[PDB]
Design a protein around this ligand. Structure first.
Ligand SMILES: [Mg+2]
Ligand SMILES: [Mg+2]
Ligand SMILES: [Mg+2]
Ligand SMILES: [Mg+2]
Ligand SMILES: [Mg+2]
Ligand SMILES: [Mg+2]
Ligand SMILES: [Mg+2]
Ligand SMILES: [Mg+2]
Ligand SMILES: [Mg+2]
Ligand SMILES: [Mg+2]
Ligand SMILES: [Mg+2]
Ligand SMILES: [Mg+2]
Ligand SMILES: [Mg+2]
Ligand SMILES: [Mg+2]
Ligand SMILES: [Mg+2]
Ligand SMILES: [Mg+2]
Ligand SMILES: [Mg+2]
Ligand SMILES: [Mg+2]
Ligand SMILES: [Zn+2]
Lengths: 118, 80, 98, 127, 155, 60, 24, 206
RNA sequence: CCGGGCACUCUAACGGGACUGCCCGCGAAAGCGGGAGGAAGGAGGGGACGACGUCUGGUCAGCAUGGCCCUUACGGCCUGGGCGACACACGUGCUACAAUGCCCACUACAAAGCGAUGCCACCCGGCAACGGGGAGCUAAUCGCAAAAAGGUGGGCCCAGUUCGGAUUGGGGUCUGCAACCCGACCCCAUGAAGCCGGAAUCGCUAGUAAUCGCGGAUCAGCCAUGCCGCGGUGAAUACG
């Protein structure tokens, strides 16, 4: 049931399925199935043309999803990065940004360990 | 995911000093030690020298940085 | 009709002190609610034996604050007499509010 | 008319009030099978009765407080064994070979310092 | 155990069958000390050996264990830098310990998603004479024999 | 306890923020209990004496 | 698990309350 | 180093507190700092008198302070002199008007706090540590005592290398939490450094 | 809940009780094995407690202290920065990698502690953190509190997933003179590695290990997954 900018959830419950949409997840799932009054447990394949239409309508108009959403974040980071901003540098140098200790566990933001001679 | 409830913060000596320059039109170069102050449109166009703990750095303020605090533009440490 | 909680650190300088307020008010008023215990509130301090490092030795210190009740129903002048200012022990503090 | 017994375990207190009857066991104003809602071992608690052909000759009102259902289960088992002997003293004569009368003294060991859990000691290295 | 020979910790009989072996088996299933869910799993397994076998579960259980019990095993013993696999008898105590342990082990290697199924099917194939548990038992006994040569290091 | 740093007693600090415990015997500004105004070390010393009423050797 | 900020148990572990762990 | 302070180790039984007053969460830390301030004065004042113990009881603005001594005369003064000059500085300290009794010590040889305080004395005058201690232990053993034992720290004699002198006689069980052993410390400023004295006096068991 | 009553639970104080005392076997004796009585049996279980001495062990930044050295300064005040830096290496931990599980709902058993400008019932506003209002307690009579695991029901259907929550974007709450460096918290969004870990290596012998949650000290707040302590459920194995 291609909803948000070319989505495709199927064979699984709609809520769980709606998730596969970028800007969507658990929370916003209920909201859409709640307001759009569709049973959350129906298989996307068991949906009604009348419901899919409705769903898409709410979801696509109410929240910034997929591609567009990314564009925003991208530009958001490039922003505090274009400006002197400290967080900018961190995004630049590549080290964490939410004031965490880098002497150790910072692998997720740093990547594989580039071991050097001691 | 920032914070500061209701009532932005800016140190007096810096604030009631910046706007004091607007009255006289415009000034050239300032310098505070309170990097704790929030930036505000009142500053747009000015140049505040923020102390990092060792020096006073010229920090040209712009509309795009109106929310950040001076310190964010005066990096504390020196690395590689 | 007389709430008088006896609190002390020594469980003997109390049990004894309450045994007074009871007798010195038994034959003067009713018979009193006898001495009532009430769970003790033990404080605790756990400090490292020596200074600097050695963080695995400690040693434990408490400070149990015992309790008591008494409670005399039906006070009769001579009762508030045998009491009044006829207290003795030093390791006790009393609260009255009959 | 009635028969009492206490019983306690792993820090749990069970009040046992036996009375002749059809075997209607209650616990805190609740059906036995209600308080111990499917806890497999629950049955245990009454093992002393079933150990003297009772149960179907007795009935019991029970108050249980402190700890957890498992302890309570055994705490009960005791009183019901004590009262059972309190009812008829010649009972223990064969109720003891199963020690239903012993009050399991096994209790949580204090948490010592320098050690994660009384015994569980911190792990080390470079040794 | 340097002082005296440890006590074979006596177990309490099974509530549902009054057997101590069952409890033992139940204990090996239990993990994180959750005897309920442990006891449960086992019993559902017995009920499954019903909807599938006209024989009494306990009957199955007993026979399953009896087959997964190794009667000979290898134990190391240094003698000149090279430690040889000495084959020796397996005492009933361990013979039982090893069996139950192996049952629960093999059972949990199985593909069926539900716990009790895995256990019932393992108990089942156990009495049948097949299945991973009985496998280990056999690979072991094979180890002895394959070392009769070193049997003279009995002790 | 650098003396000049016994300026804790100075009450008025500008902001109650800058107010800190300090041992009322040694000056220790660490592991300084409240119910005693003492540091973990003196608490131990005096306690061993008796100058800390009630404070006995805990055991259980 | 206990690590999940936005789930029942996670709230408990982190000691807090919120939409995922109401006061009642 | 090990061994628990034999006093704090017996505070329960065979040894009572030196401050038997009950305050509370809000007061306690205050009524505590007080005693100190007190003992502080009673220390750097009544030294010459030879202060053994210095109890302190309270009842709200009513404080005891039964200073035990060897030479009560020094505490008193001519007539009733001193035991007033100080009874004065006292309320200047504790704004809670307190007494200032005085009890005497039955033999300054059974008073560990003194014996130790004593051996420390000789050590400052430059006496012979080994003997000083041998004597001390004796003084104590002659004047009763089911056991006694003194101990000095190191640098004995002025030696660049710190040592530790012994001396002990008659049962002095530190493990039998029932015996009852008065224990006393005592420093010893010196030309070249501090030394430390300890006295244990076993007297009566049950 | 009220009357009412102390029996029962409990609260806390004193005391009773276990000594190989009794029974049989062995023994010179001490004692050993078994057995009855008994809540408990041979040190019932756990604490406190650590000999003469060792390491020139640790600590002069707790404190005390000999000598040494500085005295517009090696002393003092302050604002800001730093102790939180990160190509790397190690120790102790936390949370996981899932179905003996995760989620939602309903529903059941704890112990030990803490509470004046503190715990904060109940109420209303908010998805919420939190805010506004406000009762009770000086606390066995009020509050923190919900114990969690568990039990019942329903969902997920073996997938990097309804496993897992890193990381990052955005919005906001509270503490605080002030959260850039550098606080915690809530909500939305993002949703990483991880499929049980090489060589090697740690803990534990019973209500122990393993697992589950609860309190407290410090403390404005908090970087506590740390430490000290509490109780629920509750094993395996020891020939030697
Ligand atoms: Mg999504
Ligand atoms: Mg430590
Ligand atoms: Mg440690
Ligand atoms: Mg535990
Ligand atoms: Mg100093
Ligand atoms: Mg502070
Ligand atoms: Mg999850
Ligand atoms: Mg001993
Ligand atoms: Mg050295
Ligand atoms: Mg060193
Ligand atoms: Mg020095
Ligand atoms: Mg400074
Ligand atoms: Mg550091
Ligand atoms: Mg950790
Ligand atoms: Mg993924
Ligand atoms: Mg998987
Ligand atoms: Mg052991
Ligand atoms: Mg062993
Ligand atoms: Zn101190």
């Amino acid at each position: 049931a291609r909803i948000a900018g070319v989505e495709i959830p199927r064979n699984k419950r709609v809520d769980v399925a709606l998730t596969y949409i970028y800007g969507i997840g658990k929370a916003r799932a209920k909201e859409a199935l709640e307001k759009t009054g569709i049973n959350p447990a129906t298989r996307v394949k068991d949906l009604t043309e009348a419901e899919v239409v409705r769903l898409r309508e709410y979801v696509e108009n109410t929240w910034k999803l997929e591609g567009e959403l990314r564009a925003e974040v991208a530009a958001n980071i490039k922003r505090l990065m274009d400006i002197g901003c400290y967080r900018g540098l961190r995004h630049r140098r590549g080290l964490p940004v939410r004031g965490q200790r880098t002497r150790t566990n910072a692998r997720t933001r740093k990547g594989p360990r580039k071991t050097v001679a001691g | 995911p920032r914070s500061l409830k209701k009532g932005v913060f800016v140190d007096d000596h810096l604030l009631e000093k910046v706007l004091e320059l607007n009255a006289k039109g415009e000034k050239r170069l300032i310098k505070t030690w309170s990097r704790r102050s929030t930036i505000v449109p009142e500053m747009v166009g000015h140049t505040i020298a923020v102390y990092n703990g060792k020096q006073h750095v010229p920090v040209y303020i712009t509309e795009n940085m109106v929310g950040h605090k001076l310190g964010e533009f005066a990096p504390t440490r020196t690395y590689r | 009709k007389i709430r008088i909680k006896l609190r002390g650190f020594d469980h003997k300088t109390l049990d004894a002190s309450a045994q007074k307020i009871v007798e010195a008010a038994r034959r003067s008023g009713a018979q009193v609610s006898g001495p009532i215990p009430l769970p003790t509130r033990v404080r605790r301090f756990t400090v490292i034996r020596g200074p600097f490092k050695h963080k695995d030795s400690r040693e434990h210190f408490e400070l149990r604050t015992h309790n008591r009740l008494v409670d005399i129903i039906n006070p009769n002048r001579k009762t508030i007499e045998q009491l009044m200012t006829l207290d003795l022990p030093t390791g006790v503090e009393i609260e009255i509010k009959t | 008319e009635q028969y009492y017994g206490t019983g306690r375990r792993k820090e749990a207190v069970a009040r046992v009030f036996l009375r002749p009857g059809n075997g209607k066991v209650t616990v805190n104003g609740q059906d036995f099978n209600e308080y111990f809602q499917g806890l497999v071992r629950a049955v245990a608690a009454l093992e002393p009765l079933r150990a003297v052909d009772a149960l179907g000759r007795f009935d019991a009102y029970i108050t249980v407080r402190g700890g957890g259902k498992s302890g309570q289960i055994d705490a009960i088992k005791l009183g019901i064994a004590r009262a059972l002997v309190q009812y008829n003293p010649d009972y223990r004569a064969k109720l003891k070979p199963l020690g239903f009368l012993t009050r399991d003294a096994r209790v949580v060991e204090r948490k010592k310092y320098g050690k994660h859990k009384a015994r569980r000691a911190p792990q080390y290295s470079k040794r | 155990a340097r002082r005296r020979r440890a006590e074979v910790r006596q177990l309490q009989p099974d509530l549902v069958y009054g057997d101590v072996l069952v409890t033992a088996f139940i204990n090996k299933i239990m993990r994180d000390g959750k005897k309920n869910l442990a006891a449960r799993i086992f019993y559902d397994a017995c009920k499954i050996i019903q909807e599938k076998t006209g024989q009494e579960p306990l009957k199955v259980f007993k026979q399953a264990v009896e087959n997964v019990k190794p009667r000979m095993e290898v134990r190391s013993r240094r003698v000149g830098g090279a430690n040889y696999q000495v084959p020796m008898e397996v005492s009933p105590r361990r013979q039982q310990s090893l069996a139950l342990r192996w049952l629960v082990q093999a059972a949990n290697q199985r593909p069926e998603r539900r716990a009790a199924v895995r256990i019932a099917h393992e108990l089942m194939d156990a009495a049948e004479g097949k299945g991973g548990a009985v496998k280990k038992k056999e690979d072991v006994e094979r180890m002895a024999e394959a070392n009769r040569a070193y049997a003279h290091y009995r002790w | 306890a650098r003396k000049a740093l016994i300026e804790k007693a100075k009450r008025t600090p500008k902001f109650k923020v800058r107010a800190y415990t300090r041992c009322v015997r040694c000056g220790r500004a660490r592991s300084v209990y409240r119910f005693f105004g003492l540091c973990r070390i003196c608490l131990r010393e005096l306690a061993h004496k008796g100058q800390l009423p009630g404070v006995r050797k805990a055991s259980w | 698990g206990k690590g999940d900020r936005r789930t029942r148990r996670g709230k408990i572990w982190r000691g807090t309350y919120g939409k995922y762990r109401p006061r009642k | 180093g090990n061994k628990i302070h034999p006093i704090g180790f017996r505070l329960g039984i065979t040894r009572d507190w030196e401050s038997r007053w009950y305050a509370g969460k809000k007061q306690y830390r205050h009524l505590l700092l007080e005693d100190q301030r007190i003992r502080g004065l009673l220390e750097k004042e009544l030294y010459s008198a030879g202060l053994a113990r210095v109890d302190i009881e309270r009842a709200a603005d009513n404080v005891a302070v039964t200073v035990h001594v060897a030479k009560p005369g020094v505490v008193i003064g001519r007539g009733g002199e001193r035991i007033r000059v100080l009874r004065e500085e006292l309320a200047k300290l504790t704004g809670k008007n307190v007494a200032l009794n005085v009890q005497e010590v039955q033999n300054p040889n059974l008073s560990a706090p003194l014996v130790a305080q004593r051996v420390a004395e000789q050590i400052e005058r430059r006496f012979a540590v080994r003997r000083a201690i041998k004597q001390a232990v004796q003084r104590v053993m002659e004047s009763g005592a089911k056991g006694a034992k003194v101990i000095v720290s190191g640098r004995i004699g002025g030696a660049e290398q710190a040592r530790t002198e012994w001396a002990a006689q008659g049962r002095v069980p530190l493990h039998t939490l029932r015996a009852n052993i008065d224990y006393g410390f005592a420093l010893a400023r010196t030309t070249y450094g501090v030394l430390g004295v300890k006295a244990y006096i076993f007297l009566g068991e049950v």
